[PDB]
């Protein structure tokens, strides 16, 4: 997969040129923000259970119809699948935050997710509501460092 540094390397290699001053400034900016990004990623990892608990509660308080019979989150199995998908979103958001790039979300998460949900009848707007709830819960904990990755997942899903 790709992080920011590999993105810069790939760009320069496709141009067939050595790194220049601008590319070095870009990679230094990446190295500068890296430590804050690891702190955010470690905090998310340590508190992942709490984040899932709060975000699932927020989603199912916003939309109580999902849990009632006939809803897409009505069973132990469909509820477990739902919280599992939120777990996926958080884990891959942490990956993207460490990488500094969203291509891992496009490849491992978004590609085929719309068709999976349409095939199964998962309500995509409600899943986006869940991603937004997770974004708020996570921002309440680490700040605004992971906002762009959740926004990426939300745009890709919608």
């Amino acid at each position: 997969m790709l992080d920011a540094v590999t993105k810069i390397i790939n760009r320069t290699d496709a141009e067939g040129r050595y790194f220049a001053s601008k590319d070095f400034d870009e990679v230094t900016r990446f190295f500068a923000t890296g430590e804050a990004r690891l702190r955010a990623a470690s905090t998310i990892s340590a508190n992942a259970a709490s984040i899932l608990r709060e975000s699932a509660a927020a989603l199912f308080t916003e939309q109580p119809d999902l849990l009632r019979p006939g809803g897409n989150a009505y069973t132990s199995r469909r509820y477990a699948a739902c919280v599992r998908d939120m777990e996926y979103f958080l884990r891959y958001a942490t990956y993207a935050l460490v990488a500094g790039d969203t291509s891992v979300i496009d490849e491992r998460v978004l590609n085929g997710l719309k068709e999976t949900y349409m095939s199964l009848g998962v309500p995509i707007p409600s899943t986006v509501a869940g991603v937004t709830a997770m974004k708020g819960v996570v921002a309440s904990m680490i700040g605004s460092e992971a906002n762009v990755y959740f926004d990426h997942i939300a745009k890709g899903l919608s």
């Binding site: 496709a14 141009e15 067939g16 040129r17």
Partner: protein, 54 residues
Amino acid sequence: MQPIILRTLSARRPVQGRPNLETYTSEVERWKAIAQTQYALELAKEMSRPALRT
């Protein structure tokens, strides 16, 4: 006519044949390689340019 006049004096050069030039030939090959390298650098710079950006 009675002075001693010397008509056919031997030359300095020895009777032997020309010495082989193998070492000189190798050193000229080295200079040719050095000269070839600098033009090869220009053509190699041309080789690394991107594909369809004319």
